[PDB]
Design a binder for this molecule. Structure first.
Ligand code: FE
Ligand code: FE
Ligand code: FE
Ligand code: FE
Ligand code: OH
Ligand code: OH
Lengths: 491, 85, 324, 491, 324, 85
């Protein structure tokens, strides 16, 4: 016979002891552990709510792979990819380049907690964490690798994060701040709680429904398998937060949550928002990015935050409002700067699409619509050259995304500038500036792409030079996803 | 004489980097900005005058002031706005 | 020219051999090694920037291309769970079936006492190796080196897991012994453990990646394996404990795989003059704690002195075969 | 360490012994074993060419199921079935009803060999055989069961072989003669050699390519998984045939092969031929049923038969010729009698289709084409009632299929009648009649549907009565697969 | 009215409970029971028609609805390979690992001799059960009864397989013994086997389905299991053969499942007056051969008479618990 | 008087069961057969006469012979063929 899990589980995490041959601080350096003057004894109240042991893990996870890898082999000759909507293909190319290596990087972020947490329970969970993102990174390399021979852009699933292409830098700037360069307790809050629990879990659900709705099985199955792994490790920040609140530290914990949520949101507004509202074809649009945010992300945050004993972040109302705006900015920047990404962006402003946009966002045609009016006239009039750029946008110094916002009859583009030790910095929002201010030493001497341009680091110091510097060449450089087909609606 | 600024063009959606000259008047700053905005994403308004304003504090420069005299930080952000005058 | 579609990933192009699954999902993946002067996309003076400049890039253990490392076993996540789900069916099968047969009831009172002292408290040393191998993961200079440390760390969790489980089965069968309550005082106060505990506590703050590899990979693990698996295991069998004799031989399979990759790593280091000497100094600094660890533990066992001589020579053997 | 398979494999089949407490003939009754006066010693030269042992089997087969069942769960919400070509749906409905239970029945046919073969090697192979068809029958029930709620016709995957609907009787009449009611050595020749090796193995390959070509993954994966099981048991008749030839019995073995191949072919001409040439849409037609027969079935037979030391069956030339004809007959009968099957047959005689038919079969429009000319005129002229029947076709007394053949300017329909003990029997071909003649006692008193009709066993003795007797009702009764859409081409 | 689409298969409709996977792929599948007067779609006087009229429909063991039978374990092909691939990893794990450890080399010369006589030659009795269970498959009146016999037959092939494999490992380790060459003469001529051999040779021509069930399912198997698995197995362990002690306990898991379904079958038969008496006569006719089988085999073992008394009573126990 | 036969209609593709009467002439046999063949799958040939022939041996019955006199086995197969006469 076999024991019941609950009878021996506790022994798997009864692993703390009192060092003798080295000191506690030596073995758990504050800069790696972030124990924050709360004692080993007090970190032991840490109780993961979802439990799993080694044999359960290797057995359930052997089954998940068998499934996903068999679905993939079975659909491979069919080539769904050669006849997918080109906005879908693009969604895949963007996802693979932005995330595959950052998934892999998250195994180190998990390893940080696995070695340096003072919660025995956190260390073991993070071991499984560390395994999970080993899987995510490898399966997200193995999948896109199917498509290398169809287009160099698929090589970006591996290369992106090795380049200085601006989107890759916005990715690293996020990931590194959240999970690579923070102490263990911080990583548990800022990554597993704010980003993973806060955003990934739902995002991957929506993303899996869309693959299916697009007719892309392989991908639906991949995403939705990865998604079933999430909460096993995502749950880790929860108990950390209880512990900080119950000891002196509600404000340290608040402040970390505040920063991680904004940072997340900004990434999400360029990586996800454009996709929902412009790339997925009209007849598949199930809800708007703003709808999706309100229903599946934002209320889960207030629920979580109330249960933890924390407050809504000071920037909450602004954030609500920005659901109307930011991602429309980021889409327009990405489309407009399209030879600077490695995917083909989709304009998504055919008349039917503009109607949809107008009911999801009263005011759209009056604001966002004008810029697209002008882009459209030009295209109809055989002047395509006024629809690609000749300069750089200003890049925010915190999110590394362009500082953009409401155009047209409600013009409202603002720059939250700051002079700090003889340098001028630019911020796309009030919250982005405040992330720098509460912790200037963490960001001072970082330079965004524009900074580098201005500084002399990009040579030749023109657009062709910046292309080479970002590792982009013809064949990889983005262009209009439908090749300007939506333009015939206007003639 | 070459001097970088950040153009926040009226009714555009995005601040852009625009190299001006220290010798340029505001009117010539405004012309160099418009090139990245008028007929790409903003509609000409030819019964209007392009004025240059400091973004941070809303100071309006005269059409005729040159950049050298403006007291600007490299990379300073500037509203380019539609006025009569 | 538009860039042509490629046959494999760009960093692998023109190899002769079609890249394996293994190469495809394991190589050239760390990006913090892009810019040694600024590994992370933040301010270059953050503590974490410092930590990696010092403990990864200024390691004295050096190679021009650490990304060329290849795990001789070529584990990926998928083939790791194929392999360990097989071995776990075998080990959970032993647990279930020996329980059915009343095996815990057949052991003698003396032996039970020996399990409380020499077996139980390993939950600490094996969790300590888990922390040790997981530190190697997050500081090694290449993703193929990190991954061996990934899978190895999952093994060390495995061995903690077995021990957590049997310790419960032992407490249910001999509730008067303190199984489960007393391991921390034994590990903390028993002279037979203080050698190991010192060895591992000091190894756990060796921050330099090559030094962590050596201290955990080359010196602490063969010593822990020879003493706790080989020597306690065949004493176990000789005393009638067929379960622990087999369990330990089961874990020694993991341990041997950890040795195959450690050995590959060292073969690769020895391609640069200086490295052998670098590794040898590291071995000389740490080995006498290993000696002490084996001495204090094996000598408190039956036939103590002989268990001492064989653990000592079989662990030195591990390094001698890598050419150290 | 582990032994190598080849080192101990022989011991798994060193299981013959010399009975003592009962006699050899008691333990191996001739009527079940068919040892045919060849000794236990001589049956021991039996050597399966594909070997497998129990742990290899349960391990490779656990993987095949994991795959197939995961593909199925992953594609289920997508409902490919609700939007498949209705000729494809029909192909599925026919396959499931004709075969699911006959697969299951083949496990008994395998069990026959497993208990009663004198070849130790055959008994163990047949054990795995017996396992294989346990799988086939169960997975072919579990799959179609997905679709019960969409149409009663899917209930036929279970019910068909429990009814007296004429196609079900043609199925049993085949299966029972080949594999349920023969001695062990016979089953090994007639089922595993002639039908499975001869026809299934290739058929399932083609069928799997077609599922894929139709966009039906689930089914492609199901069929092509089952197909990887085939040759493990199909190989069993091969060594039996060597043994019979090498002892006195080339003619007993010949005669069994002859009978099984004809019987197979007839089944295949109604179940597969119509599907290839009329149901699968034109643009998916990869080759003709005749092409497929020549390339993938017929030459494999001559190769096999030459290697075994056997001859081409006396009926070979006729059989070649009939590739031009029979299945066109069976399709026309099934379409014409369509409310007597449980699937909707596809007419497949649109103009484009008739062109295709004409190049695959010079002469088609002149022969087969006329009948369809008349059916078409009627449909164009609003007289649909002259395109359904008012009587029964004559049923062949061996294959239980209608006696049909070349119409139009090459009229050639023949009836190979035989008077035997005061009864008149009807045969669709010279070979069908000869199957009865070489072994009249095996078939005498069987009665085909017409016989039953004529005899008084069907009451009311009219068409509505025959419908009830065949267990068919509105909702199950077949009609035109495209609902007469191909008719608009003619107006 | 067009016939409405149904919720499940027509023969299962209106059940209260949604039918399980098990019900869905196992029930009401034999069709030869449609027409008792003509089971196959051929001439009604073929030998095979006769065989089934006589041995299946005229069985004295009777029920109005044999299709209502349900395997208490609910095996289907898919869950059968999940279960046995688990147990096979465990058993192939024992093989691999005890080999690694030289276990065959530690057994005494006397014991080796005992394996050649009492263990080896089981390849015959276990193949004979395989033939025995596979006959039950092809004559039982319902597909749910056939399937239990399907999976059971695959087990009996399993036990032949283990034995085929160890017999090779034994011949490699003691090439002078004749392992692998001599089993047929032992099985044929050794008095210790002639009881079993007679029991099974006579059981193999019991053609009546209910009589085959009883003779193989109820009388021959508990006797073979108690003598070869329970009694040789714990003698094995007591002599140092840890592998065979565990292997046999591993096979006894299969055997117990064969008993769970046999027991369900008999519970179901006892719903019709007459059946108990029918089964009891069958048991009385066969049991004295089982007695002889146990006597001739167990008495040639060490502590023979006591192995005789316990095999006898534990196999009677199997039937006593079904109410026979 | 009711008597079953098997109709092999000229230019049709399939033999069918046709109940005739023992009193029927060949001409009335031919009419009862045509009903299952003409205008379902064979084209009328109105400058032609439907003759009845025994399938097995090719014996032509006169138009006017009745079934009773024909010497037929129940269920006997009959060619229904297009002739002048
Ligand atoms: Fe992940
Ligand atoms: Fe994650
Ligand atoms: Fe099959
Ligand atoms: Fe088959
Ligand atoms: O994740
Ligand atoms: O098969």
């Amino acid at each position: 016979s076999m024991l019941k899990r609950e009878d021996w589980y506790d022994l798997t995490r009864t692993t703390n002891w009192t060092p003798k041959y080295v000191t506690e601080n030596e073995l758990f350096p504050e800069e790696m552990s972030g124990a924050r003057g709360i004692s080993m004894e007090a970190w032991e109240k840490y109780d993961e709510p979802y439990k799993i042991t080694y044999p359960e893990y290797v057995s359930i996870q052997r089954e998940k792979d068998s499934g996903a890898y068999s679905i993939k082999a079975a659909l491979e000759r069919d080539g769904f990819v050669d006849r997918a909507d080109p906005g879908w293909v693009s969604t895949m190319q963007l996802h693979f380049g932005a995330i595959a290596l950052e998934e892999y990087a998250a195994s180190t972020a998990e390893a940080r907690m696995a070695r340096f947490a003072k919660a025995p329970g956190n260390r073991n969970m993070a071991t499984f964490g560390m395994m999970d993102e080993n899987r995510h990174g490898q399966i997200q390399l193995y999948f896109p690798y199917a498509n290398v021979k169809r287009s160099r852009k698929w090589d970006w699933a591996h290369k992106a994060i090795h380049t200085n292409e601006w989107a890759a830098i916005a990715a690293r700037s996020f990931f590194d701040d959240m999970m690579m360069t923070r102490d263990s307790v911080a990583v548990s809050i800022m990554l597993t709680f704010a980003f993973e629990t806060g955003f990934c879990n739902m995002q991957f659900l929506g993303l899996a429904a869309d693959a299916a709705e697009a007719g892309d099985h392989t991908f639906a199955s991949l995403i939705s398998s990865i998604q079933t792994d999430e909460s096993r490790h995502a749950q880790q920040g929860g108990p950390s937060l209880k512990i900080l609140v119950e000891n002196g530290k509600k404000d340290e914990a608040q402040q970390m949550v505040d920063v991680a949520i904004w940072r997340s949101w900004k990434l999400f507004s360029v990586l996800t928002g454009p996709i929902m509202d412009y790339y997925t074809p009209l007849e598949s649009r199930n809800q708007s990015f703003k709808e999706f945010m309100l229903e599946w992300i934002v209320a889960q945050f207030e629920r979580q935050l109330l249960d933890l004993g924390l407050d809504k972040p000071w920037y909450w109302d602004q954030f609500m409002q920005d659901l109307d705006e930011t991602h429309h900015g980021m889409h327009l920047g990405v489309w407009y700067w399209r030879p600077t990404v490695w995917w083909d962006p989709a304009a998504g402003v055919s008349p039917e699409e503009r109607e949809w946009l107008e009911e999801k966002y009263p005011g759209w045609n009056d604001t966002w619509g004008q810029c697209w009016d002008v882009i459209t006239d030009n295209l109809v009039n055989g002047k395509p050259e006024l629809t690609v750029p000749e300069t750089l946008p200003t890049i925010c110094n915190m999110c590394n995304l362009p500082i953009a916002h409401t155009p047209g009859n409600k013009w409202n583009v603002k720059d939250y500038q700051l002079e700090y030790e003889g340098r001028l910095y630019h911020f796309g929002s009030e919250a982005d500036r405040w992330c720098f201010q509460i912790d200037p030493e963490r960001y001072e001497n970082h330079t965004n792409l524009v900074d580098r341009f201005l500084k002399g680091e990009i040579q030749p110091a023109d657009l062709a030079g910046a292309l080479m510097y970002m590792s982009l060449e013809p064949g990889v450089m983005g262009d209009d996803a439908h090749d300007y087909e939506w333009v015939k609606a206007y003639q | 004489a070459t001097f970088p600024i950040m153009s926040n063009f009226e009714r555009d959606f995005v601040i852009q980097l625009v190299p001006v000259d220290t010798e340029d008047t505001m009117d010539q700053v405004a012309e160099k900005c418009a090139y990245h905005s008028i007929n790409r994403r903003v509609h000409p308004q030819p019964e209007k005058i392009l004025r240059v304003r400091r973004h941070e504090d809303g100071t309006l420069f005269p059409r005729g002031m040159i950049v050298s005299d403006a007291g600007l930080r490299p990379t300073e952000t500037l509203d380019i706005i539609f006025m009569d005058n | 020219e538009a860039l042509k579609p490629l046959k494999t990933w760009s960093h692998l192009a023109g190899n002769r051999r079609r890249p394996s699954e293994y190469e495809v999902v394991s190589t050239n993946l760390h990006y913090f090694t892009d810019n040694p002067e600024r590994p992370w996309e933040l301010d270059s003076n953050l503590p974490m920037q410092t930590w990696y400049k010092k403990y990864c890039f200024d390691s004295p253990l050096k190679h021009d291309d650490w990304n060329a490392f290849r795990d001789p076993d070529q584990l990926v996540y998928r083939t790791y769970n194929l392999l360990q789900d097989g071995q776990e069916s075998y080990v959970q099968g032993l647990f279930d079936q020996l329980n059915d047969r009343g095996h815990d009831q057949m052991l003698t009172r003396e032996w039970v006492e020996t399990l409380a002292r020499f077996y139980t408290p390993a939950r600490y040393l094996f969790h300590a190796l888990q922390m040790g191998s997981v530190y190697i993961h997050q500081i090694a200079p290449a993703s193929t080196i990190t991954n061996c440390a990934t899978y190895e760390t999952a093994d060390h969790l495995r061995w903690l897991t077995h021990t957590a489980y049997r310790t419960r089965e032992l407490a249910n069968c001999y509730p008067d012994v303190g199984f489960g309550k007393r391991e921390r005082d034994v590990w903390e106060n028993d002279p037979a453990w203080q050698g190991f505990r010192e060895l591992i506590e000091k190894a756990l703050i060796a921050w330099d990646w090559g030094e962590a590899f050596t201290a955990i990979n080359l010196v602490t693990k063969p010593a822990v394996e020879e003493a706790l698996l080989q020597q306690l295991g065949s004493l176990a069998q000789s005393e009638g404990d067929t379960l622990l004799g087999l369990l330990a031989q089961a874990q020694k399979r993991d341990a041997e795989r950890h040795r195959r990759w450690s050995s590959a790593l060292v073969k690769m280091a020895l391609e640069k003059e200086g490295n052998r000497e670098v590794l040898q100094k590291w071995v000389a600094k740490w080995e006498p704690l290993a000696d002490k660890a084996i001495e204090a533990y094996c000598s408190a066992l039956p036939d103590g002195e002989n268990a001492i001589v064989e653990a000592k020579s079989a662990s030195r053997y591990v390094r001698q075969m890598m050419g150290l």
